[PDB]
């Protein structure tokens, strides 16, 4: 058989029979508490401008 | 078979008989507390402008 | 069998026997408490403008 | 068989014998609580502009 793969940017996930126990139990602030789990971010913030002029 | 695979960004999940137990337990903040939980952001902010012009 | 794939981008999930226990159980805010819980986050907020002048 | 496939921007979920317990037990604040469970986000908040001028 002829296969041909072609990937830019790989994280491919592959498991079998995989266990995983994640805890976060016991967390204290006297200020401001933030807790972000598995994440994921693929988010822009762009500005494109052609031709800008500044004539003064 | 003939198989071809043109991936630019690969973040693809493939699992069998796998287990994932995750727990947050305990969590107290004196301020403002926040629980972002396996987010997925995609979002996009953009600002695009062609031929932008500032004469004085 | 002829098979062509071609993604740009890629996050398909494909699962069998596959089990999950996601728990949050005691959270507390002196302030604003905020939880989100798995988001997906696919919107845009954009400005797009051509030929923008500004004369003085 | 001949087949062929052409996505931009893929997050199929295929899954097959899969069980999913997710709890939020206990939830506190002293000022406003906000919880928000599995949300999906395709929104667009747009302001499109062609020739914009500003003479003075």
Request: hydrophobic share 30%; proline share 2%; glycine share 10%.
């Amino acid at each position: 058989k002829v296969q041909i793969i072609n990937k830019k940017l790989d994280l491919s996930n592959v498991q079998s029979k995989c266990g995983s126990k994640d805890n976060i139990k016991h967390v204290s602030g006297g200020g401001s508490v933030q807790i972000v789990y598995k994440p994921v971010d693929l988010s822009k913030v762009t500005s494109k401008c052609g031709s800008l002029g500044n004539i003064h």
